Chain A
């Protein structure tokens, strides 16, 4: 609880009550998820880090073009 108080006072300038968070979370449906992902995640840049036996790792460009579909 103390970590939640302090972290929120620095980030938001206040503590959000539990009821407010639950009210904001309640009105998010599938059409709002689609809107936000289309704006920020669709056809976007990616960064990658890796370690170990990586002979079969995809190309960066393969990962970059997997952020969109050609169907639809």
Chain B
């Protein structure tokens, strides 16, 4: 059974189910994408902190 698109609300259904769809997508991506990203971000900071200290142990008096 299918209804003609000229006889349906076609934007309200998107928002009626917004919270359920957003929960499903964001829950799926959390562990696999976010957890490795936080680790990569931290490594970027540790790297930049060791570069500065290494410049002063060689050039500063």
Q: Using a CB–CB distance below 8 Å, which chain A residues touch chain B?
A: 45, 60-61, 64
| CA–CA, A64 and B6, complex, Å | 10
Chain A residues, CB < 8 A from B48: none
B2 (CB) vs chain A CBs: closest residue: A60
Interface flags, B1-37, vs A, CB<8A=1, else 0: 0101111000000000000000000000000000000
- Minimum CB–CB distance from B10 to chain A (whole Å) comes to 13
- Minimum CB–CB distance from A47 to chain B (whole Å) comes to 9
Given contacts A45-B4, A60-B2, A64-B4, 6 further A-B contacts (CB under 8 A): A45-B6, A45-B7, A60-B4, A61-B4, A61-B5, A64-B6
Chain A residues, CB < 8 A from B7: 45
Chain B residues, CB < 8 A from A60: 2, 4
Chain A residues, CB < 8 A from B2: 60
Closest 8 CB pairs of A and B: A60-B2, A45-B4, A64-B4, A60-B4, A61-B5, A45-B6, A45-B7, A64-B6
